[PDB]
């Protein structure tokens, strides 16, 4: 599922991310534009053997199991495919324990290169929520 740049607002300010830790609204939605340009089903494969997968692009190695990645962990307790859903409740579930994990939003490499130090509150601009 392609959701369209409101609509992924809404569902995320639902499930509680405006503000969370401090990351206005907006930071969520340049996230997940960068990591997977809105699309779920997304999956890229890194060089070390572990994917990153879904609207948030969470990692194999260490917060969800793919059953391939050599050492993961899974501190998401969940398969990464319930990551590819059209709904977001699994991957914003498991992006909150993320972002508290001791590094902020800077785990998710695509909002560190494109997204921090901007003015982010750019991306819910038409959003009525």
């Given at each position: 599922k392609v959701f369209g740049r409101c609509e992924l607002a809404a569902a995320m300010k639902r499930h509680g991310?405006?503000?969370?830790?401090?990351?206005?609204?907006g930071n969520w939605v340049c996230a997940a534009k960068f990591e997977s340009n809105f699309n779920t089903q997304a999956t890229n494969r890194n060089t070390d053997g572990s994917t990153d997968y879904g609207i948030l692009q969470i990692n194999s190695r260490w917060w969800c199991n793919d059953g391939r990645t050599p050492g993961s962990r899974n501190l998401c307790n969940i398969p990464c495919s319930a990551l590819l859903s059209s709904d977001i409740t699994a991957s914003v579930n498991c992006a909150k324990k993320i972002v508290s994990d001791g590094n902020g939003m800077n785990a998710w490499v695509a909002w560190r290169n494109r997204c921090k130090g901007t003015d982010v509150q750019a991306w819910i601009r038409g959003c009525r929520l």
């Open positions: 991310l405006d503000n969370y830790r401090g990351y206005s609204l």
